[PDB]
Amino acid sequence: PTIDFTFCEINPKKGFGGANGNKISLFYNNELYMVKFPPKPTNGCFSEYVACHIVNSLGLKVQETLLGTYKNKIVVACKDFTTHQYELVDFLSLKNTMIELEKSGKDTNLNDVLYAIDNQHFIEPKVLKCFFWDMFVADTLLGNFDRHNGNWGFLRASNSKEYQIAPIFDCGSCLYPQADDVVCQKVLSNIDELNARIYNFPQSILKDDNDKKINYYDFLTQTNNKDCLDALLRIYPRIDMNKIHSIIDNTPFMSEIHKEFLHTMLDERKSKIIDVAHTRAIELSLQH
Amino acid sequence: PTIDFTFCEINPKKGFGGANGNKISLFYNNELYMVKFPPKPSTHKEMSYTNGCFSEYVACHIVNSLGLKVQETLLGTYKNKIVVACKDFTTHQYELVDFLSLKNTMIELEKSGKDTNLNDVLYAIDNQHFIEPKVLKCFFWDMFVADTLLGNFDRHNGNWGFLRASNSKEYQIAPIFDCGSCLYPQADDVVCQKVLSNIDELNARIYNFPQSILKDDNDKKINYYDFLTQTNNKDCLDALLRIYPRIDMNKIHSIIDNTPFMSEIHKEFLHTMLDERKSKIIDVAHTRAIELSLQH
Ligand SMILES: Nc1ncnc2c1ncn2[C@@H]1O[C@H](COP(=O)(O)OP(=O)(O)O)[C@@H](O)[C@H]1O
Ligand SMILES: Nc1ncnc2c1ncn2[C@@H]1O[C@H](COP(=O)(O)OP(=O)(O)O)[C@@H](O)[C@H]1O
Ligand SMILES: [Mg+2]
Ligand SMILES: [Mg+2]
């Protein structure tokens, strides 16, 4: 069975931001979900569901997701984590405070993002930095091309000065959302084609000091950033390609060709990037 | 008065969104302000990057002078930088929920909530449940009128919205904010001298641009002059009728005179541009508005 969200009670007193589609607030299992629609003619909902589930299997706190129908559309339902007086403040907002940078908090220069993390006061700077790096590692595996400063952040309970890190959310930009059944069968059949979708792009939205988008493969097979390496060592063990392939297999609605596309691509991303980087990480770390 | 904010107490537990430059939360005179900095480019040789500060100050004050609820603004410096401090209204446990969010709820339109098609926005207004439609419509055309005098080229769906009490459940309309895109932000002393000399160049800034970010059903931006000297939308006309008598060109021209830092060529440019917008657009639109309400 596939879920039908159509007749779930709509909450008319809530909306959500973002430009990437419509959202409504609705009740399901007696709890609030942010239901994200696609733009009418949906690969963004799929990626959202698969990816967040993959992020959960990695032991990272992430929003809970479901796929289901709603009238004419396939949509991903995301458990609302800003009910009960919780409020979401993106990293973009927090970076906007870094006034001595003379950069907008929307700019994704890596060094600046890290500077912002080291100088902010919502969250223990060291805790937050481990989070950010955990996320980059999971975004590497997922091939996330859009982790802009607006796509992560913090919850503040109302009436307090207290922040926690918010569940990972919006992974809709992960796992090749642009790929047709047609694009799939082509990538699987052409080695130079698949290779390019590991080594060349998707690339990370974070940029180096020459303003060039960060290449996942080039970056973490060459980085000497002890925090990034450490996060590789933290997370690698929690990758479970069986659980992951199983997530993909049990994904509702999705076509078998697309499933096959994600199986192969996730494996390739796992071996071509994570493994190579992780094996180097051990090597340097054992170096005493 | 030019206020040095430099030693006011920072509040490190609050930040602010948007893409046009930095923001900090600080205490001034026992109250929280959102202090904005203009975006400073890597280089600004013979250009300005700093005008949005003044457009925000001067435009909000005019909106105040129009009797519409709007954020209080102060020009000042903070560590040797020009800023516009705007009294923080998401304090005392209010969240700002922008219209964009609300518009995102209108699934049946199959348009994104970022899209600014006028009929679609009017539809969102009629069908939302944050606020009595009638009250929201009125607020919306009042803002449009204000935005017509001020020449707002950027009233997108995230540049206005609602306040929700964190306690929660209910909304009121948020004060007008972000008027930084009004009053020819792209004008520097060179442009002002030019406009004040060449009337064709002033007229281009009356009849051709700025244009409303709002769009007609052909997907083009709404021209301020054409639209409200031609509209038969009763709600729009009714806002013109309410706002006209509140237009006090004295409070307005003084608001300008007493603006810090601005040059006498820039002050003169605003003085002139407001007279011109006031007479060529508003008066023209308002005169017809009176006429249509008449009887035989
Ligand atoms: N699980 C969630 N709970 C509560 N609010 C959320 C959740 N996910 C996203 N949001 C809010 O809704 C906005 C839109 O979600 P997002 O998935 O980023 O949509 P888009 O891709 O269209 O930007 C986010 O910026 C965030 O503020
Ligand atoms: N007066 C205010 N009080 C509290 N919060 C505000 C106020 N004005 C704006 N904000 C919040 O800060 C964000 C950025 O403000 P804005 O003036 O729109 O900056 P920008 O022009 O850089 O986008 C807004 O989207 C709004 O959510
Ligand atoms: Mg987003
Ligand atoms: Mg704004």
Q: Say whether B104 and A17 touch across the interface (CB within 8 A).
A: yes
Residue A104 β-bridge partners? none
The residue in chain A having the minimum alpha-carbon distance to the alpha carbon of residue B25 is A97
Q: Of B252, B212, B277, which Cα lies nearest the Cα of B59?
A: B252
How far is residue B97's CA from residue A105's CA, in Å, rounded to a whole number?
20
Q: Which amino acid is at B186?
A: Q
Write the CA distances from B61 to B66, B70, B177, B179, integer angstroms. Answer: 9, 8, 11, 10
Residue B23 CB contacts under 8 Å (≥ 6 apart), including other chains: A93, A96, A97, B15, B16, B34, B35, B36, B37
The residue assigned the tokens 């909000």 is B60
How far is residue A102's CA from residue A98's CA, in Å, rounded to a whole number?
8
Ligand 2 pocket test target in B88, B94, B178 with most atoms within 8 Å of CB: B178
Collapsed DSSP state (helix, strand, coil) of residue A85: coil
Other CB atoms within a 10 A radius of the CB of residue B229 amount to 17
Option in A15, A95, A101 nearest B104 (CB): A15
How far is residue B136's CA from residue B128's CA, in Å, rounded to a whole number?
10
> What are B165's two structure tokens?
């009490």
Neighbour-count burial of B210, counting CB atoms closer than 10 A to its CB (0-12 exposed, 13-18 middle, 19+ buried): buried
What residues does ligand 1 touch, defined as CB less than 6 Å away?
A: A 16-21, 34, 36, 63, 78-82, 88, 169-170, 172
Cα distance from N-terminal residue to C-terminal residue, chain B: 53
Residue A283 β-bridge partners? none
- The closest-lying atom of ligand 1 relative to the alpha carbon of residue A90 is 27
Residue A104 CB contacts under 8 Å (≥ 6 apart), including other chains: A95, A96, B19, B20, B21, B22, B39
Resolution of this model in Å is: 2.5
Please enumerate residues of B whose Cβ is less than 8 A from a Cβ of A.
Answer: 12-13, 15-25, 37, 39-40, 78-79, 81, 93, 95, 97-98, 100-107, 110, 112-114, 128-130, 158, 166-171
> What are A188's two structure tokens?
């699987």
Collapsed DSSP state (helix, strand, coil) of residue B187: coil
Nearest CA to ligand 2 atom 22: B20
**Residue A201, annotated as binding a ligand:** no
Tell me the technique behind this structure: X-ray
Q: Say whether A104 and B168 touch across the interface (CB within 8 A).
A: no
Domains in chain B, ordered, with CATH? 1-93 (3.30.200.120), 94-296 (1.10.1070.20)
Q: Say whether A22 and B114 touch across the interface (CB within 8 A).
A: no
Give a three-class secondary structure readout of A226-282: HHHHHHHHHHHHHCCHHHHHHHHHCCCCCCHHHHHHHHHHHHHHHHHHHHHHHHHHH
Q: Say whether B15 and A102 touch across the interface (CB within 8 A).
A: no
How far is residue A52's CA from residue A56's CA, in Å, rounded to a whole number?
6
Q: Do B252 and B274 form a contact (C-beta atoms < 8 A)?
A: yes
Residue B77 β-bridge partners? B4, B82
